[PDB]
Amino acid sequence: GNGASRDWKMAIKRCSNVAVGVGGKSKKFGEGNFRWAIRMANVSTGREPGDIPETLDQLRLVICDLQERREKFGSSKEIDMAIVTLKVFAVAGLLNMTVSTAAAAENMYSQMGLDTRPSMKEAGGKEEGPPQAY
């Protein structure tokens, strides 16, 4: 539109203020994590320079296909992390709404009607930490 990659550099600057975990809140993502997942996905689902999402609809399908194909091949921290970045980046970027945590981003994304696998309990846990000296 008006510039080169302003909308992009912006969506990233904001996403950088996003947390990875939910029961910790400390470590945040970065342009490297986002570009990593996106780029990798663009290849497996494109294999070319001019093969990136331009509309919320286009990106929406890319994600569903990314997690779909990847899932069939198997699960992995790299895969799960990839999908997470796509979500947080989509909301914190397209919606310019820098969520609080990775889960929160993917939550509103699916709850909004962008995903195809709505869940109530993704990750959590109670009573954690080392043992006590009694």
Swiss-Prot record:
**Where's it found, cell-wise?**
Virion
- This chain belongs to the protein called Matrix protein p15
In the UniProt record, what gene is named as encoding this protein? gag
- Show which stretch of the intact protein is covered: 2 to 135 of 450
